[PDB]
């Protein structure tokens, strides 16, 4: 089952080069990968490109530098996962209660 893990984690494994076995949902982008906010503008442009959303990585970073959230809730892969999925479930939810692919 493709999930919206599955395309982020080929999303940092071309732009950081980072391969997909070093890879896990449980493993921290900045903590872990050693991705910095100069190589994660790319991961989160990817994203917003590749699901077609619109990722708010200016609100994301201002989180973190606002002592408001933590790196954790939008760096550590299935978290980021989780709010991704929560912006392609958003324009999702532009569907018409019509429960049916």
């Given at each position: 089952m493709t999930s919206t893990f599955d395309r982020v984690a080929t999303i940092i494994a071309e732009t950081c080069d980072i391969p997909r076995e070093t890879?896990?949902?449980?493993?921290?982008?900045?903590?872990?990968?050693?991705?910095?906010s100069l190589d994660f503008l790319d991961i989160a442009f990817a994203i917003d490109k590749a699901f077609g959303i619109k990722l708010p990585l200016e609100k994301w970073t201002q989180e973190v530098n606002d002592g408001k959230a933590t790196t954790e809730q939008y760096f550590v892969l299935k978290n980021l996962a989780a709010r991704i999925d929560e912006l392609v479930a958003a324009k999702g939810a532009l569907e018409h209660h019509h429960h049916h692919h």
């Open positions: 890879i896990t949902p449980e493993s921290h982008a900045i903590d872990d990968l050693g991705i910095d």
